[PDB]
């Protein structure tokens, strides 16, 4: 379960292939990679 | 640094996520944390969809 804000950002780092998990990344960068990743997943989904 | 400028841009990212994620109501304000929660569930769904169900080999 996602109980706090940091748990949410950390989860997103795991889920999004393009977000590095072994160097520092900003919250802002996380949001942008998440956005791009969603756009990619949606076009793939739409193909079906 | 321009603290508020970066915050407005983060805020823009949050608003975009509101558009992208179906489960999120757009004609209503939603907290940043709830937005990330909807985002996480939605990405998980899309992954399961694309990784398993949408495969020809899916049983
Ligand atoms: K990752
Ligand atoms: K929406």
Numbering used by the authors:
A (entry chain B): 35 to 82
B (entry chain A): 30 to 88
Paper text:
The ID proteins belong to the family of HLH transcription factors, however, their lack of a basic region accounts for their inability to bind to DNA, distinguishing them from the other basic HLH (bHLH) transcription factors. By regulating the levels of Class I bHLH proteins, ID proteins can effectively control cellular fate by shifting the equilibrium for Class I:Class II bHLH heterodimer formation.
The asymmetrical ID2 structure contains one homodimer consisting of α & β monomeric chains different predominantly in the loop regions. The final model of the ID2 homodimer contains a 54 residue α-chain and a 47 residue β-chain representing the HLH domain. The main difference is the absence of the extended helical basic region in ID2 compared to bHLHs, hence ID2 is highly unlikely to bind to DNA. However, our structure reveals C42 on each monomer pointing away from each other; their distant proximity does not allow the formation of a disulfide bond.
